Structures are given as structure tokens and as C-alpha cells.
Design a protein around this ligand. Structure first.
Ligand SMILES: [Mg+2]
Ligand SMILES: [Mg+2]
Ligand SMILES: [Mg+2]
Ligand SMILES: [Mg+2]
Ligand SMILES: [Mg+2]
Ligand SMILES: [Mg+2]
Ligand SMILES: [Mg+2]
Ligand SMILES: [Mg+2]
Ligand SMILES: [Mg+2]
Ligand SMILES: [Mg+2]
Ligand SMILES: [Mg+2]
Ligand SMILES: [Mg+2]
Ligand SMILES: [Mg+2]
Ligand SMILES: [Mg+2]
Ligand SMILES: [Mg+2]
Ligand SMILES: [Mg+2]
Ligand SMILES: [Mg+2]
Ligand SMILES: [Mg+2]
Ligand SMILES: [Mg+2]
Ligand SMILES: [Mg+2]
Ligand SMILES: [Mg+2]
Ligand SMILES: [Mg+2]
Ligand SMILES: [Mg+2]
Ligand SMILES: [Mg+2]
Ligand SMILES: [Mg+2]
Ligand SMILES: [Mg+2]
Ligand SMILES: [Mg+2]
Ligand SMILES: [Mg+2]
Ligand SMILES: [Mg+2]
Ligand SMILES: [Mg+2]
Ligand SMILES: [Mg+2]
Ligand SMILES: [Mg+2]
Ligand SMILES: [Mg+2]
Ligand SMILES: [Mg+2]
Lengths: 151, 262, 141
RNA sequence: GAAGACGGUCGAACUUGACUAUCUAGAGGAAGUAAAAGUCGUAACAAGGUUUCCGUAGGUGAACCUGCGGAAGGAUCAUUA
RNA sequence: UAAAGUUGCUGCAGUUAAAAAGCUCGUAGUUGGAUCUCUCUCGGCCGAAGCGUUUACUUUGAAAAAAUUAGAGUGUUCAAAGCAGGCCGCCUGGAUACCGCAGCUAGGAAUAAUGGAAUAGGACCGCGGUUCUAUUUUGUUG
RNA sequence: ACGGGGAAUCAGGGUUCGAUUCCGGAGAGGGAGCCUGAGAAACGGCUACCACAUCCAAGGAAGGCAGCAGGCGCGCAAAUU
RNA sequence: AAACUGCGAAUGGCUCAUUAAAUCAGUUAUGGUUCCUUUGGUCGCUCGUACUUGGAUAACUGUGGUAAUUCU
């Protein structure tokens, strides 16, 4: 998978990839070291992020983002943007005059890392709050759980 | 509102000052200082409302401008100086020393201390950071930074500071079984032994504390102040020994005192 | 029957407000046409200039002449017929004089005998009609 | 180092068109409502003197009349091998 | 605003008083039949760790401005108020409750949703493999 | 329609009010642009345009009470230069 | 006294036109920023005329201009 598709050169800023190498240690390529971080709160780092090659500065595991504040869950409704998806959060709002609830929802645009592959319309995503990534995106997908009847 | 605010409405002042409603529109508005505005006792309130040494604000100013009041061993001529928890107020002309200790009902009590005990104080540690060629630094709840602290001293611990020099003399580690006072919230002013601390990563930690009478109560970690090692406090406690009476037993005690009076 | 499920709050509320629009008083108070059409403009009283004295026939079962006045409100220029309550009181009113007018008693609805009249005169030339009637004050000159 | 000038930006506001919200002058035309005791009749209420009413269509000074198809809220809960 | 159970959630009406769509299908919405009685590792028997599918619900705990409201004390001469005051320098207050909803917290598991094996794309025991990899090796070096 | 704390009424549930002394927001005739400053897009600072308006020797100069009093106007409706 | 310098004048007071997920309220975040002041730390850590440096300007003194300004 070629990772150079923009006008600029895509690269993890922390990793230095031009270290001098003698010809005796030139067994193909050096297998460019991968930068990854362990986000806390008991979330495992996907093996894809560790062993991947994608460049994503908004990735919670390989990019420059900090998970802080609220951790929420939603259902994936649309995946038509690049590296970001639209999830749906449903809830019941109480009305005190009638002592009864009404069904409400709100969509949320959340950044989805390339480390989560095979995400389908319908699965559950645990997202975590971060700094503003775009005009409307303030959350990053931290965990993906499949639907109840997946193959 | 452009720029900082300089006034404080009397009804908007913190309730533990015990300010009335009809004396004026405004309140003393504590100056910026080592203690937060909501958690301090301005010098004027203590010197006029509490001790009744002065009748008006001008008399408080006249008292302070003769350099009679010392807060933690230093002369303070600012009448709105924020004096807060564990501060030592010394008046040598009349020869008394007070320590600002929360009462059981969450108010700064007039607590007189001996001059031997007025030479030190206890400070909670807020953070530890290394700077400037690998020199460690401690920051206390009193906004004083101390370089070269003991490597064992960690956050949420308590250090005994010699007021004359400003150096650490000993410390208490934050651990279960150590005596503590609650410095904020519903249980403010209560004294008890730490029983258990539950950690919630990314959120606030809750500390459970058991009184000397067997009562238990929870607080947030930021509301806990280690007072003594084990059951013995390192300072003198106010007349109420940190235990909270319910309104029923308070009424019974008041009635017994009334009956025994005369 | 009505819906009764635990999740029916929105249906109940929407139905209640839609049906609330079918209440006469609620629609009158919240539609905004009544306040626009009200000559007083929502005020309790108003001030006007007496245009002419008029006699209005009482409704059929009882025969009488009700002495009213045509007034022109200062604040919006609308023309109004106002009733001069007591007897001889029409003699206290002149042409082209300031008069303070109030409602008649039922929220812009005609009262008793007088047809199409919902206002009564309270003051004439800044002196109360009751004071003139009881001899407490005289008409200014 | 002042006045000043090219360019850019923010941009009040001006001119010219278009649209839009409220109030409004206004010949006339056509209704509703009261006050209404006039004129022509009698449509409806009794089998109201052609049973009433509904939908549709035409016509007529006026109520209304007629055709078609419905209802009984009908003047028949019933009519005999 | 109450009276107005004349806006009806509590709690109204629809044969004739105003009122059920001409009839059926049908998306969203609303509602929906029985059934199922915590441990393996770490540190000093406990403290720790998960995770039991997730909740809703219920109870508790924390955090939640003052004023206002409720309310404790207190003879403003009484009262509305106030936060004062009492004893012959002392003594004593300036309480407490309540604060939807949402968000934290820890118990309960009836009720109500939700899942867990039916191409075995099953659980547990041992096996064997495949691959990569962290350190044992080891006064030391090496 | 500035939002809350709250207010009136109320068996229980509710309905209505909250410009108004506490907290938060906005504005200083209407827009816009700035200087200084830690902090204004500040108006009891400045620069323009729009609307009003003051003095003038006609060349020019100076404005901003939704601060306290007070006046006009508007009004049913509100206090001492 | 005046004048230069420094600080404040961004608080307070008034009003409710605008404003309909905006304001605001509760809850969280800044591991994404700024912060006069108060308070504490730091301030021989740097290997490179001083027993004190230079030019102004105000107040003040004198000549004024404009019908007129907290003009100059
Ligand atoms: Mg202000
Ligand atoms: Mg945190
Ligand atoms: Mg220039
Ligand atoms: Mg016949
Ligand atoms: Mg007939
Ligand atoms: Mg007939
Ligand atoms: Mg009928
Ligand atoms: Mg009512
Ligand atoms: Mg009732
Ligand atoms: Mg009814
Ligand atoms: Mg009917
Ligand atoms: Mg039917
Ligand atoms: Mg359906
Ligand atoms: Mg069931
Ligand atoms: Mg409160
Ligand atoms: Mg009370
Ligand atoms: Mg709650
Ligand atoms: Mg408005
Ligand atoms: Mg409102
Ligand atoms: Mg208001
Ligand atoms: Mg208004
Ligand atoms: Mg305000
Ligand atoms: Mg402003
Ligand atoms: Mg004005
Ligand atoms: Mg401005
Ligand atoms: Mg002004
Ligand atoms: Mg101002
Ligand atoms: Mg004024
Ligand atoms: Mg007037
Ligand atoms: Mg009045
Ligand atoms: Mg000066
Ligand atoms: Mg200063
Ligand atoms: Mg300043
Ligand atoms: Mg300093």
C-alpha cells in the first residue's frame, strides 16, 4: 500500500528515517521503526497500528492527539468521508408533565483511524473526546465492536 | 466584561465569612494571594468581624499600618490579604497566635495556639517537578515552591514547614490510617482516619474517611489534607475535635448546657 | 382512546398544543390578531378627544336612550363609541375635550342594553366623572 | 525621521436595479352582522297540504323546482298460498 | 391564576347534544404472549486484577453560589423583619433540608430491552506444529 | 424573547410571569475601523461614513445622560437640577 | 503648588435593542492558550568612566497667533 498520495511527503514526525547505515547492515531495508503510543483508560493498541504503515496525524495511537474527558459510544451510520465517519447516539428524554420519555438522537462526526479496518454500517464504536480536529469533529474512535449478527 | 473584576457583592461573598445583609452592598474582595478567593479569610474579616478588635474598616487599616499583624511570620499591611488554611496569625503587641483551622461547620474558627506551635505549619504538596539542571521542586497549597525536597515526598503528602526558615522538617505520606481534615465540600472541617482510596483514572479519586466516633464519609482526593501520622494530629485541633454532631445531639447538648447554667 | 405507552410523551405534547389552538380564549390570547384589532392596544385605559355626542337605542326588550360619545384615541387615531354612565353626566362633556376612557367590564364585549359599545368614560378634562356627579369638583375653566 | 504615493486587507456608506415585511390613500364591486315590523310570496315545522334530508347537475323574482343515486333523522319495526 | 375534569399526564368527550377518515393496504412512531434458581493471578485471610453482554430502573455516596423557599435558635416591646445575642471579663450562635435533567459513584437484580454454539466462523484439557520476538545463559568481560 | 437563581397561584398534577438590585451576556444614536495597554474592537478614548444637532466674525471648531439629578416628547403609566 | 515619571481610568453604574442550540444552566476539558497584580522560587551558574556615562524635554522665564476649544 503506497502511502505517498499527497503533494507533501507523509511521515511520522517523531521517527528519524535517514540514520546512516553501513553496507554491511543493508539487508534489504531497515524496516522503518514505527511510532505508537499507549492511550490509557485500559484501551489496547490495535496490532494494525503497531505493524501498519499508514500515516495519520489524527490517529489516537500513532498521531498527535490526547484522549481526555468524555468517553461515549455510538452506532456507525455513514462512512462516506476520508478517515472520518458519522455515528448515531440515541437516548430517551424525560418529560415531567406526562412522566414519559421520548426517543431522541444526535449524529456525531468522529475521526476513524486506518487501524480499524472492516468497519461496517451498524457496529458499535467507543469514541473518546479530544481537541478539535476539524470544524465539527471532536472525538476519535478508540474501539470497534461488531454487530450482534456478524459473520 | 473587559479585564478583571475588582469588586465583590456582599450577598455574593462566600457564606463561611458569616457576613450580614444590611451592613452594605459590598464585601472585602480578598486580594490575590496564596489562597483562592472562595477558600480564604481576608484579614479585615478576621480582625473586625471575628476578633472584634476593630469596629470599622478604617480601624482595621489603622491596626495593620502599625505593623502589628504577622501572617506566617511576615508583617502584612494589606487589609484584604487572603489568609487561608493552616495559616498562622501572630499579634505580638497583645501576644497571641491563631491558626486558621476549619471548624466542624465549615468556617474558620478563632483558634488560639501556643507560641511554640506558631513557629511551624503544615502544607499539602500540590506538585513535584524537576527543573533547572535537574533540581527537584515542590509546590504547596500555600503557593510556596521549595527546591531540593526529600526524594520520598510525593504528591498529596504533607510537609511541616519551619516558618522562620521556610524549609521542610518532616513529612507525612498520604496513606490509609493517617489522620486527615476535609478542606472542601459537604464534609468540610471533618477530621478522621483515611480508610480507603478508590482510583478512577481520568476522573476524580474518592477517599473514604472514618471519624473517631465510627462515622464514615467520602470526599474527593483534592479535598483531603493529611494532618497527622496515624491517630495523632501534628497540630492542635479546635474545640470541636473534628467530629460532627447531628442536629439532635447538638440540641441536646445546648439544652444540657442551658440546664447546667445558673 | 389516548396513547398510554412509556415513550409517548412527544405525541401527547404535540397533540395537546395542536388541540390547545382550538380553544377560543387561548387562540385569542396567543394569535396576535385580537391585540392588533383592539383599539386600546392592550392597555387598560386610553385617552381620546370627544368628536360628538350620540344617543344609542337600547336593545329591544327595554326602551331607552343611552348617551354615548364618539372619541378619537390619541395614541392611534382609532374612533370609538364610549358610554357616559350616570344621569346628567352627558352635560359634563363638551365637544373637542380630553376624556379618559376605560373598558366596560367584559373584555371587549358589549355590556347589557347598549349594542356595540364596550367602553365607558372615566374622566372628562382631567377631572373624574364621579367627582363631578357628586359635586366634589367642578368643571375647569 | 514627518508629509505624501503604488498595492493589499477590513470596510462603513453612496448610486443604480431586483425582491421582500408592516401600515396605508383609494373609485367602485360583492357579502356578513345588527337595527330592523315595510314589499312579494309561503320554503320548513302536522302526511305543513308535492314526506323531509344528503351528494351531484341544470333552471328560476324570491324562498325554491326538476333529473339521477342514497338515508329514515318517516308518515311503515307487522300484511299473511 | 384558581374556579376549568371547559385542554383532561393525573383526568374530558365523538349513536341522537360539537365530534370515527367512504374503505382497505402500508413506512416511520407507539405497543407487543409463556419460558432460563464472580474467580485465576500479584502484594501484605485480606488489600489488588479483571469482566459478568450492555443498560434502563431502584437505593447510596460525591460534587453541586449566595439571596429566595421550607426550617432550628433568638421577647424587634409584638409583628413583618434582623442575625443577632445571654451572664455576673466570661458564654454562645450565625444550623439543617431542598436543589429536576444530564454527567460521576457503589450496592440490588424483580421488571423491561440486548447478546452469547445450528456453514461449529464452539467451550475446556492436553498435544503437536508455523513464524517472529523480549530477555536466562554469564565476577566480569566476552 | 436577554438566559438563569427565582415570582404569583396551586389538594395532587399543573398554568402563567421573570425589563427589575445576585450570576452570566450584550450595547452605549446606527454601522465600521483602530491606538494604547496585561487586559478594550473601550465610546464620561480616537478615526471615518449615516441620522440628528451646538457655537461661528462663514475662514473654522465642538458633539453623544441605556451614569446621578433634571427637561422635552411619548403615553393609562413612574420621585429632588 | 506646578510639571515630568509611574498606576488607574477595561472596575463600578445604566439599560434590555439585538440574540432561538445562540445566550444561559448544570457537567467536564485545555496533555490546546493568555494572564498586570499578590504570593514563593530564581537573579556572582554565562570565561567575555565603573568612586557613575550621553543627548534631550517639561515645569519656569520671555515673544506670540486665532472670533472661538482642556488649540498651541
Ligand atoms: Mg461592568
Ligand atoms: Mg484529568
Ligand atoms: Mg500617512
Ligand atoms: Mg300525499
Ligand atoms: Mg308549506
Ligand atoms: Mg312539503
Ligand atoms: Mg342535527
Ligand atoms: Mg385558567
Ligand atoms: Mg381542579
Ligand atoms: Mg366537555
Ligand atoms: Mg352531531
Ligand atoms: Mg365509519
Ligand atoms: Mg409501521
Ligand atoms: Mg413479555
Ligand atoms: Mg441556592
Ligand atoms: Mg425564613
Ligand atoms: Mg443525579
Ligand atoms: Mg426584545
Ligand atoms: Mg422567558
Ligand atoms: Mg428582566
Ligand atoms: Mg421591553
Ligand atoms: Mg447584570
Ligand atoms: Mg462594549
Ligand atoms: Mg438615546
Ligand atoms: Mg465603539
Ligand atoms: Mg455618558
Ligand atoms: Mg464606560
Ligand atoms: Mg438621567
Ligand atoms: Mg401627557
Ligand atoms: Mg404609579
Ligand atoms: Mg500624570
Ligand atoms: Mg499596581
Ligand atoms: Mg490602565
Ligand atoms: Mg516575585
Amino acid at each position: 500500500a503506497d502511502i505517498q498520495t499527497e503533494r507533501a511527503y507523509q511521515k511520522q514526525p517523531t521517527i528519524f528515517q535517514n540514520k546512516k547505515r553501513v553496507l554491511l547492515g543493508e539487508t534489504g531495508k531497515e524496516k522503518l521503526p514505527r511510532y505508537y503510543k499507549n492511550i490509557g483508560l485500559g484501551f489496547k493498541t490495535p496490532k494494525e497500528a503497531i505493524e501498519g504503515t499508514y500515516i495519520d496525524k489524527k490517529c489516537p495511537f500513532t498521531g498527535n492527539v490526547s484522549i481526555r474527558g468524555r468517553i461515549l459510544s455510538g452506532v456507525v451510520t455513514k462512512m462516506k468521508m476520508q478517515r472520518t465517519i458519522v455515528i448515531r447516539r440515541d437516548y430517551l428524554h424525560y418529560i415531567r408533565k406526562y412522566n414519559r420519555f421520548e426517543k431522541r438522537h444526535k449524529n456525531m462526526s468522529v475521526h476513524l483511524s486506518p487501524c480499524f479496518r472492516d468497519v461496517q454500517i451498524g457496529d458499535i464504536v467507543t469514541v473518546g473526546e479530544c481537541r478539535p480536529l476539524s470544524k465539527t469533529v471532536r472525538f476519535n474512535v478508540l474501539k470497534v465492536t461488531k454487530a450482534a449478527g456478524t459473520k | 466584561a473587559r479585564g478583571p473584576k475588582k469588586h465583590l457583592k456582599r450577598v455574593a461573598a462566600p457564606k463561611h465569612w458569616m457576613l450580614d445583609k444590611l451592613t452594605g452592598v459590598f464585601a472585602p474582595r480578598p486580594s490575590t494571594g496564596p489562597h483562592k478567593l472562595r477558600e480564604c479569610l481576608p484579614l479585615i474579616i478576621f480582625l473586625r468581624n471575628r476578633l472584634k478588635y476593630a469596629l470599622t474598616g478604617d480601624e482595621v487599616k489603622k491596626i495593620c499600618m502599625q505593623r502589628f499583624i504577622k501572617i506566617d511570620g511576615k508583617v502584612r499591611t494589606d487589609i484584604t490579604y487572603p489568609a487561608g488554611f493552616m495559616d498562622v496569625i501572630s499579634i505580638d503587641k497583645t501576644g497571641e497566635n491563631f491558626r486558621l483551622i476549619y471548624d466542624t461547620k465549615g468556617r474558620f474558627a478563632v483558634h488560639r495556639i501556643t507560641p511554640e506551635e506558631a513557629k511551624y505549619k503544615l502544607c499539602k504538596v500540590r506538585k513535584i517537578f524537576v527543573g533547572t539542571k535537574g533540581i527537584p521542586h515542590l509546590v504547596t497549597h500555600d503557593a510556596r515552591t521549595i527546591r531540593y525536597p526529600d526524594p520520598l515526598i510525593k504528591v498529596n503528602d504533607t510537609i511541616q514547614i519551619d516558618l522562620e526558615t521556610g524549609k521542610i522538617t518532616d513529612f507525612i505520606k498520604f496513606d490509609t490510617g493517617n489522620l486527615c481534615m476535609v478542606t472542601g465540600g459537604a464534609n468540610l472541617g471533618r477530621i478522621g482516619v483515611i480508610t480507603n482510596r478508590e482510583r478512577h483514572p481520568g476522573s476524580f479519586d474518592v477517599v473514604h474517611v472514618k471519624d473517631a466516633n465510627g462515622n464514615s464519609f467520602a470526599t474527593r482526593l483534592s479535598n483531603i489534607f493529611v494532618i497527622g501520622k496515624g491517630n495523632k494530629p501534628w497540630i492542635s485541633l479546635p474545640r470541636g475535635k473534628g467530629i460532627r454532631l447531628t442536629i439532635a445531639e447538638e440540641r441536646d447538648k445546648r439544652l444540657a448546657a442551658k440546664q447546667s447554667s445558673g | 382512546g389516548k396513547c398510554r405507552g412509556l415513550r409517548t410523551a412527544r405525541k401527547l405534547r404535540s397533540h395537546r398544543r395542536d388541540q390547545k389552538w382550538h380553544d377560543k380564549q387561548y387562540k385569542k390570547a396567543h394569535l396576535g390578531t385580537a391585540l392588533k384589532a383592539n383599539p386600546f392596544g392592550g392597555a387598560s385605559h386610553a385617552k381620546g378627544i370627544v368628536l360628538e355626542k350620540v344617543g344609542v337605542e337600547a336593545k329591544q326588550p327595554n326602551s331607552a336612550i343611552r348617551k354615548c360619545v364618539r372619541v378619537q384615541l390619541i395614541k392611534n387615531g382609532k374612533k370609538i363609541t364610549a358610554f357616559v354612565p350616570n344621569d346628567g353626566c352627558l352635560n359634563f362633556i363638551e365637544e373637542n375635550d380630553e376624556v379618559l376612557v376605560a373598558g366596560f367590564g367584559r373584555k371587549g364585549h358589549a355590556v347589557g342594553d347598549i349594542p356595540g359599545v364596550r367602553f365607558k368614560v372615566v374622566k372628562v378634562a382631567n377631572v373624574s366623572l364621579l367627582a363631578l356627579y357628586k359635586g366634589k369638583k367642578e368643571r375647569p375653566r
